């Protein structure tokens, strides 16, 4: 299962990253936020 | 590089799948359309 | 900005709750909804 | 429904984009290929 969150002020981004990393740490799991390779989407003009 | 196309301006999906599969065949590549594990997105209630 | 987390050890239900909770704490309410299915053209060789 | 295609063999990325765009134009809908906003994935260290 894949989960996605989209941020934009509302909620801070770094704080969010913290929270999620913490969640994993609290479950005994280590990891970091990796930047994904760029990707393209076909956008309809209308 | 990853490419993403989004359908639903109503266009036949089966035709699209076919056209693309064909395209790969023409370029000497075999493959099928496989399903991806679901993705949930956190949706703001607005 | 877009964030992605993959699960599957670690309970999915609680993760959702924690995250939803996090947002409620920052004043924004929301729910986890499914995205419409995705198919990937899987190369054989 | 969403479709995903990943490349880089003999299949050139430019022609794939064109074929897809062509497919849509042929169905009466115009559009262009745009780059997505950056995405970060929390990568487990094991």
UniProtKB/Swiss-Prot annotation, chain C:
Sequence repeats lie at residues 2-45. It comes from the Bacteria. It is found in: Secreted, Cell wall. Binds to the constant Fc region of IgG with high affinity. This is Immunoglobulin G-binding protein G. The chain holds residues 228 to 282 of 448 of the full protein.
